[PDB]
Design a protein around this ligand. Structure first.
Ligand SMILES: O=C(Nc1cncc2ccccc12)[C@@H]1CCN(Cc2nnc[nH]2)c2ccc(Cl)cc21
Ligand SMILES: O=C(Nc1cncc2ccccc12)[C@@H]1CCN(Cc2nnc[nH]2)c2ccc(Cl)cc21
Ligand SMILES: [Cl-]
Lengths: 300, 305
């Protein structure tokens, strides 16, 4: 019993964290096999940063301009290429701690663990969701660039995020491990603003099923709703629309607890209308949206 | 920017997790050097738990009754001894992944990371506080017994907790790595209840400084208070008393933000008597008490491990 925000054990990712230095910039790299992946902005001189031509800047670099450090050992860079917004530094040593891994691009609402690093050294591990506006609400200071987001597929690490930047509101933006940004963001200092964030409705419903499994039932009601009536209400509270895919995904939790999805949907409508009235759900006074249906089933 | 509940990187502890099987019970063990530590209740069946004589049960066991598995390799148990509520299985092979480590007993209010395991396999890592009532509000299913709580000090893992059981309210009880329980709990299937929990006041204050560092200032007020007046108000809302040690510990955060500890206490006093008024602090509608002052400085400064 109990319900916690839980990250994946970070050990397999720690063995991959290295420090990447290019001129005056030092950030983190992900060393997998004989390749170190890191944000391409490591080649910028904070003058290039506003409108950088990364192809032009990388063409002027040589392998000896990149200093890669894995622990107390300097790695030798023997090649450099760019895939979208990620820099790939080919090294002359394969990482012996390379786990079984895969590069996955995730969708909004999906959760993942972040291994926050500074100077190629892991300092903390936490849990995130890809916000509907494609930002992540992380905890990152200067030097965290190159920190990665991942999930563990029972032995295999699926890398889904690399941290690139912090937006003016303190939220974070980055890319998949193929360098493609999540969201309408670019790796430039140009004026960028995240869209208005919304609540991940399917995740809130998943978390309400976690509360029911844990014995919390006070928010349950005798009502059901149509999916369209629920979406009309939920959207007025800045909640994401719930699709038929989401309803289907909540099926196993619906079967486990005996509460139909549209029945739980009516509980959610009521909570949005009334608030909590001094009560908590799973020790929280707000509706939690960073637990997916897959996370709830896994944890419970 | 940002503030998250953050655990220590679990890598050094993952290399120590093994599966311990004794008869029909399977749980986790912590393999450090040539010894595997695990809850002594692994030697018990459903009948023993009602009233077990652990010395009598362990005397009837032989080294071959314990099956220790580190990954896909079976370890050979060459000795067995008991230290309080922990079982120590001496093995023929020293763990090559043994990190620099130390066994430490923590105090209520202190936080630590939990590496939740099942069948000697780590499945999740979460950060939690040792509640003032000595329970932990964990997330554990059957088979999690033997999962450990730790902190990382430079490059040294300080093991502070081993999970033993779940109380009727869903909260958890366990011991330090020397087998001594945290709290008035025993390792037996008996009617046990946790005491009434209280809020870790120093941690709430530390978390209010984290909110100020992150730009959330709405709760700040012009007022200050005496430590005695604050404690009289805090005692009334089931908050732990704040000692001069706590005030001193909050000193660096007080200096960093320009808000004196008793000045922040006056904000906390108002938050207690008046509530949040529909507002949030760090995205939370409740005052968070599972971040110590050291955790806040570490997170808002980037200390690495
Ligand atoms: O923002 C970044 N990384 C950081 C990551 N996480 C959390 C942070 C918290 C405080 C500071 C920096 C943080 C870096 C470096 C700084 N600046 C901003 C900038 N670029 N020139 C002028 N100012 C930019 C701008 C664009 C890009 Cl792609 C990357 C970056
Ligand atoms: O409670 C325990 N451990 C668990 C840990 N974390 C979370 C759990 C969630 C669901 C179930 C079990 C959980 C075990 C096993 C169960 N039983 C009760 C018992 N009664 N007859 C024999 N065993 C007891 C009783 C006492 C002790 Cl010390 C330990 C234990
Ligand atoms: Cl401090």
């Amino acid at each position: 019993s109990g319900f916690r925000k839980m990250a994946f054990p970070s050990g397999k990712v720690e063995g991959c964290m290295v420090q990447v230095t290019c001129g005056t910039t030092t950030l983190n790299g992900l060393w997998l096999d004989d390749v170190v992946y890191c944000p391409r902005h490591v080649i910028c001189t904070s003058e290039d940063m506003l409108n950088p031509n990364y192809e032009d800047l990388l063409i002027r670099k040589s392998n000896h301009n990149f200093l890669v450090q894995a622990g107390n050992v300097q790695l030798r860079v023997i090649g450099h290429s760019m895939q979208n917004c990620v820099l790939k530094l080919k090294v002359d040593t394969a990482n012996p701690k390379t786990p079984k891994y895969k590069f996955v691009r995730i969708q909004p609402g999906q959760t993942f663990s972040v291994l926050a690093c500074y100077n190629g050294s892991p300092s903390g591990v936490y849990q995130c969701a890809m916000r509907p506006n494609f930002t992540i609400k992380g905890s990152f200071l200067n030097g965290s660039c190159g920190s990665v987001g991942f999930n563990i597929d029972y032995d295999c690490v699926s890398f889904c995020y690399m941290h690139h930047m912090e937006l003016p509101t303190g939220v974070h933006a980055g890319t998949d491990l193929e360098g493609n940004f999540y969201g309408p963001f670019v790796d430039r200092q140009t004026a960028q603003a995240a869209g208005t964030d919304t609540t991940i409705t399917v995740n809130v419903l998943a978390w309400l099923y976690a509360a029911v499994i844990n014995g919390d039932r006070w928010f349950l009601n005798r009502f059901t709703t149509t999916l369209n009536d629920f979406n009309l209400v939920a959207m007025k509270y800045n909640y994401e629309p719930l699709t038929q895919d989401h309803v289907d995904i909540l099926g196993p939790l619906s079967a486990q607890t005996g509460i139909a999805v549209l029945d739980m949907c009516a509980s959610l409508k009521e909570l949005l209308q009334n608030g909590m009235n001094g009560r908590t759900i799973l020790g929280s006074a707000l509706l939690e949206d960073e637990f997916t249906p897959f996370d709830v089933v896994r944890q419970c």
